[PDB]
Design a protein around this ligand. Structure first.
Ligand code: ACP
Ligand code: ACP
Ligand code: ACP
Ligand code: ACP
Ligand code: AMZ
Ligand code: AMZ
Ligand code: AMZ
Ligand code: AMZ
Ligand code: CL
Ligand code: CL
Ligand code: CL
Ligand code: CL
Ligand code: CL
Ligand code: CL
Ligand code: CL
Ligand code: CL
Lengths: 358, 358, 358, 358
């Protein structure tokens, strides 16, 4: 389990005049890297043949560390190149996945922006729910078993895409079976089934930034998810949908910008404030930098959080050129990637790097 | 009924070197206030405990006038603080509502950007329709009674959310009853029922600005509404929707940016030109500053206006950092809030304040 | 058939110090013209009474060539005004249509940005499919006859809006007949019927720019289409849709910005690279400047191209003030219109005009 | 004598995705490095303890190559670090001096922006005069010996500061002797004495840029020299100067911005055009990038060139934030350093690196 001192004392051997920002070339790296450049940093992008073109043509990376496959980023060899470049790593979804979250927590000896420990509170549904519940945030009702279904529910399986909607116990088994005989779910997944209230409302994935330097939760932007096949499915007229044998899937393919009704911003900020206050208690020092509440706004104007991330969320890509909210601070086209880099910049200049790395 | 002279002569006692822009902290105030700052104004934000965080963290307000509840903004005490700060008030939805439109028309003795009189032509469906019809704009067919229904209609009740769709007289009563026994509509609302043609098409809420200084209608931007539960409802596959007992509601929760097919801009501009030419005749001096046509584009490329506002519409929040249309004028990230402030700026500099306040 | 030399030698008689950019006032002209101005060009806009207001109020045109009807832009009289203004014409959908594609290929003697020959590879479904197939891009399955239908298909008629969805041979004829007796399709259209796999997924219209100066395919932005009545139709709850007798139409009314999942950008770039490499072989010099792949992302994260353009696509209007992708290059609000003008600028400065005009 | 192929083939082994700009930390490096960063390059600054603070605090250097003394920059060890960083070196006064011009011409195996050969045409008074005379530029009259003095002359010695003014042969020896007995000049310097017409007029050091990509001479800015003790000496009232025993020295200490009378710009441009046309003939490929004519404007509005440089002149420091002339191109705060970096940028993108390096 990587210690702080184990990290601070690695950063102490860094050339503090040549500190770079590094990340894996995927997920949200385009504005992580662009944002870094805009803040005056030189940037390092871990990449591989076949997947490096976007980073070359957008010209956001000063140095490339090529790997055979992204799984190699855990390798001690890459950790060394990174340390020799004085890189502070900015973590994201793809990086945690390809590196392996366990390798991240105790085998990845490179300074990393954010709270290293809290990355597993986002990966485990039990910890997430604990956090969200204890922070006092609205979540969907959970159902222990298919027999408890008394309304419309969504059912999630960590399997192969692993989703269906049900309005009764009977329907639950009809659909589970369908997906089983169709070769998408095994009985192991069917037992793992997570059943929750289906919330009917508008999607707001809210992107926050907690600055430990300023001790302030900031609102940076919002997106709604664009998912396949579901957003294609519901674009088929009902009469034709009824003639089809098609199951909804919810694969993230993209994002669409959205802004919320302004009278709801006090709720939005309170939600971020609460998450932050509680996460300080449960996982010190708490949330560091970017975090996302993925919510649904019901007809009673209550935001229900069905998901959260403890680092930068893919939806930040929707405002790489700045957004309506990020503009208000200083009238600039500020991305989340640039807001991260600036926190790193300040921290270095104020000699408070210990507030933002681990 | 607040006179012009009653207002001009209050503005004459203003320190013309220290003129501020004020508004209530809600609805569209973020870019009203940010836009003001960007134009060099000091800004005043009426706010209250529990609802002030967004305005503090986005740093758009130089001075805060705190109230116990937003209903107090009609109070003579707040009118005085505002007058002592040399504030020109920028009105919007939440402000007119919390102040009370009657208090606005004859009890609110603070200079106000726009045409004070015309604020009630947006609040009364009879005046709106009169205006839109007389301006020569396409509107949905109206139906006098449930018995006149010969197609799909939408039905609106000023009640508690108060909407349903019907394709027959019989269906109208089936649904009215459902909502009655469900405790959403009383027979008073059911009689008040407004029935109109359901227009099937794409939503464009078009944001215009009429400059009385330039005598020109400008196009600033467009959004589509993001409403709950309807936009959540239609995201459920048809087969599952049929298994649910759920009524559509249309609560505004947010906005999504959109641009229109360019060949349709002459229609768009003609619509704004017509609204303006007629409103000059019907309510002198007519439209002043921001106004919105909320339209649906049918398959015949005709924009049908189902609603309008005579001040700044919430949808302007979608381009607080500028939009595709607002950019064209000077290549700037121009919000509606900033366009309002600039009109105020010019007016002061050209000594033509009488063209924009009342 | 307009020769290159026939064009180069017309451009040689041009005052190379006074080169302007011209286009017809429609489709995408707002940012074509604005982009030109931003790059230092004087701009020419072909327009007509009743349709000139947007170009006057947005102030993007320095000179107006008025016509009686846009059909007159083929007239030798307009070709001369254009040549006397040293105009390089930027072609787009509306221009090719109003001028007539045949008049464009051999009767329009004005220098034109792009590959003149390739404009008809976008107009003919046989050439398009050839190109896309030979480039190795995923396309929807084609069906030779209604009898071959073994899934859900979409059916396209070049007629009056000319679309329907079918899941069986029987349904195909039920619907064809409906549209026939309804006066939308004649038996000539019904024979012309193009049947293809209905792809269920998320719409990404991807806007690329191939720079022959840099020999590089660039990603500029993405939109999703906003079509009527379909996007209005599917916003009606299923229960109400079933009570209606309504056919879906797919008239382009507007666009909504979207960004793609970042891990998919290597696929996105590969697709543009492949299209470009093949079009060089099939229609020398190949793609010049703006081109669009109109795709659907299925649940397997495969982009299926159902359409393409070989010039600037209307969807570029969604980022006239720049977009998340166009920002990354130099942190600027770069439109496609401005990217076109810059290529023209460079070409002139480097004396490589022969790489971009025809 | 470093060959082109010897350099091109070293640059061919460069990672063309990671090309940096390098220079020695002095002379004009601040805007060479800042300009590079602004164009998207990562920057390398050769520096040493005691002289690195300005480059650290202005944050213009991403990587530092420390040396013991600047004389070490000729060392094969530094040439290697530079080659491993894919650095293109931007040469300037201090760099040529500390490296040694002979080491530069045939011992410095790093790609270098500009025409390597022509660096010695600026170092030798005979070549300079040849060039300037053959280009057809006005220069001060030369005098072969003190006996030829028939007016006011300035006398230059390459010695220890080594200057005096004389109006007669007698005065020449009076002053030479004074400086000899004072320990500033030895008889070797006194024989080396260069005597030329003293031009009475206004100093314009004109900074040009020849773009081989565009084949165009550009005007970037102008400064006047600020020299000690002379500019301090002449600030003493005449009556007091006569009471002092003080000799004028002309040590460059700084620069002051100046703009020229606009009617003189055709002369200014013609001078740069002529220098460039001739230097192409005399030293192929001629002038590459920045060059300076150091001139005096006599009362007849004729610019007399008393000096020139074939690379970037220290006076460019006066417009590191852009100047009145550099602004006109694109309304940007363009330094010479940034104009150099942009030429490098373009060259790489257009695959024309062979036009700018040697
Ligand atoms: N309680 C709920 N009610 C209604 N819809 C829900 C829901 N929970 C999830 N969804 C829909 O299903 C999608 C997938 O939800 P999930 O909880 O799997 O998010 P996620 O972000 O963890 C999946 P991934 O990480 O693969 O993007 C959501 O984006 C949302 O559109
Ligand atoms: N004639 C019509 N046809 C189809 N849809 C309609 C319609 N009139 C309204 N709608 C839908 O119902 C929603 C509510 O319409 P309404 O006329 O109540 O607008 P509004 O702006 O006055 C309500 P609020 O002020 O609460 O936002 C609209 O945003 C639109 O989506
Ligand atoms: N294979 C397919 N599967 C699913 N939907 C499809 C499809 N092909 C087309 N569509 C839908 O139908 C619309 C019209 O498609 P079409 O192929 O006519 O594009 P287009 O751009 O040539 C028509 P226009 O030129 O008039 O805009 C598309 O925008 C898409 O929404
Ligand atoms: N012919 C002339 N008439 C009048 N003044 C002259 C002159 N030649 C030079 N000077 C003055 O003497 C100064 C030094 O001139 P010099 O010819 O040594 O330039 P330089 O740039 O080669 C010296 P350094 O390289 O040390 O700056 C000039 O900057 C100018 O002010
Ligand atoms: N664009 C997005 O919203 C997004 N993109 C990726 N992700 C999440 O990040 C994870 C890794 O992304 P990728 O599979 O593209 O490498 C995915 O499993 C997904 O949960 C997102 N939420
Ligand atoms: N974001 C919006 O479009 C929006 N936000 C608010 N409004 C209108 O302004 C009125 C007051 O807003 P609020 O209820 O958020 O204080 C609301 O009733 C609604 O009609 C909107 N149209
Ligand atoms: N906004 C758009 O996407 C768009 N606007 C126009 N078009 C295409 O250009 C053609 C010409 O446009 P217009 O009919 O607006 O003159 C249309 O038939 C359509 O295919 C588009 N794709
Ligand atoms: N600021 C200037 O004009 C300037 N600074 C330096 N130089 C020239 O560059 C040569 C090297 O500069 P330095 O001595 O500062 O290292 C000096 O001998 C001088 O001729 C200048 N012309
Ligand atoms: Cl985030
Ligand atoms: Cl994510
Ligand atoms: Cl508005
Ligand atoms: Cl509103
Ligand atoms: Cl395009
Ligand atoms: Cl198009
Ligand atoms: Cl120079
Ligand atoms: Cl110099």
């Amino acid at each position: 389990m990587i210690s702080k001192d184990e990290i601070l004392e690695i950063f102490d051997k860094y050339n503090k005049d040549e500190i770079t920002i590094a990340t894996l070339g995927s997920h949200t790296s385009l504005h992580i890297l662009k944002g870094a450049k805009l803040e005056g940093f030189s940037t390092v992008c871990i990449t591989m043949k076949g997947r490096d073109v976007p980073y070359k043509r957008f010209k956001v990376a000063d140095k490339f560390i090529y790997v055979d496959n992204f799984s190699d980023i855990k390798n001690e060899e890459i950790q060394e190149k990174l340390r020799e470049l004085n890189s502070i790593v900015v973590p994201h979804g793809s990086f945690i996945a390809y590196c392996g979250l366990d390798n991240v927590e105790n085998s990845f000896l490179v300074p990393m922006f954010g709270n290293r420990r809290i990355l597993r509170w986002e990966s485990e549904r039990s910890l997430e729910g604990k956090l969200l519940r204890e922070a006092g945030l609205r979540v969907p009702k959970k159902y222990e078993s298919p027999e408890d279904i008394d309304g419309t529910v969504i059912v999630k399986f960590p399997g192969a895409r692993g989703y269906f909607i049900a309005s009764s116990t009977e329907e639950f088994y009809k659909k589970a079976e369908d997906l089983k005989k169709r070769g998408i779910l095994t009985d192991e997944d069917i037992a793992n089934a997570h059943i929750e209230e289906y919330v009917v409302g508008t999607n707001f994935c809210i992107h926050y930034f907690y600055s430990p330097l300023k001790d302030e939760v900031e609102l940076l932007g919002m997106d709604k998810r664009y998912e396949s096949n579901i957003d294609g499915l519901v674009r088929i007229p009902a009469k034709d949908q009824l003639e089809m044998n098609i199951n909804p899937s919810y694969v993230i393919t993209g994002n669409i910008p959205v802004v919320i009704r302004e009278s709801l911003l006090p709720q939005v900020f309170e939600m971020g404030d609460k998450l932050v206050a509680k996460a300080k208690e449960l996982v010190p020092p708490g949330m560091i930098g970017p975090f996302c509440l993925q919510s649904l706004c019901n007809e009673n104007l209550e935001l229900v959080v069905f998901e959260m991330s403890a680092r930068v969320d893919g939806g930040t890509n929707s405002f790489m050129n700045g957004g309506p909210y990020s503009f208000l601070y200083n009238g600039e086209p500020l991305s989340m990637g640039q807001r991260i880099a600036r926190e790193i910049k300040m921290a270095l200049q104020l000699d408070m790097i210990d507030k933002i790395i681990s």
